[PDB]
Amino acid sequence: TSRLFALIPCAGGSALPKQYRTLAGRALLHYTLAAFDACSEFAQTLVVISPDDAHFDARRFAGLRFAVRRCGGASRQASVMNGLIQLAEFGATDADWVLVHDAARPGITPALIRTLIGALKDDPVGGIVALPVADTLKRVPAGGDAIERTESRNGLWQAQTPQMFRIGMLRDAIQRAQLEGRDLTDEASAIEWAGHTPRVVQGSLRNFKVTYPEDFDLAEAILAH
């Protein structure tokens, strides 16, 4: 009876926001929306943008099934929480699932989404897609390129998105951290501070986060193919 909602958080002489940057003809956000659009089991996809956003153009995402609300906040933290609250308009309850995905990971696929769903649908908490740390870890002090020592990678995973939790538990988790003045990284860390135990499901290398110009080039090679 737990339905599936998708939540895509977006933020704004600053340059163009990353989610609107062109990747092989299409905007960056388009790949995330298309991935969730291909999954008809979702109730609705919600894009959260800033109320001052003057770059979002709905016609560039035509034919895709999603809704957009300008309920953005100061941080990604607030933007997610406001989105969870906003989901109640679409008939969402606190018992329903929400998948929060970073638009900076355009390599997301319906196959990876459905793998996460099928692996955590019966979990009391939920979890995230992640990759085990494969590379040797080197500690390099700030302000220098010199290696101090090698750090153990035993039991370390690289977190990815989407992150699958229930709306009620996640909203209250982010709420509690916002009041405590705790700056979080992802939705999983919120669940962790709230006292729950999130799960990891095997992710993918093509689900990497783009940031640097070279990451766009790789993504343009992986995608559009």
Swiss-Prot record:
Reactions it catalyzes: 2-C-methyl-D-erythritol 4-phosphate + CTP + H(+) = 4-CDP-2-C-methyl-D-erythritol + diphosphate
Record-annotated site: Transition state stabilizer: 18
Top EC class of this enzyme: transferase
Name of this protein: 2-C-methyl-D-erythritol 4-phosphate cytidylyltransferase
Job of this protein: Catalyzes the formation of 4-diphosphocytidyl-2-C-methyl-D-erythritol from CTP and 2-C-methyl-D-erythritol 4-phosphate (MEP).
Family: Belongs to the IspD/TarI cytidylyltransferase family. IspD subfamily.
GO biological process: isopentenyl diphosphate biosynthetic process, methylerythritol 4-phosphate pathway
SUPFAM superfamilies listed in its UniProt record: Nucleotide-diphospho-sugar transferases
Listed HAMAP family: IspD
Keywords: Isoprene biosynthesis, Nucleotidyltransferase, Transferase
GO molecular function: 2-C-methyl-D-erythritol 4-phosphate cytidylyltransferase activity
UniProt EC number: 2.7.7.60
Keyword Transferase included in the entry's annotation: yes
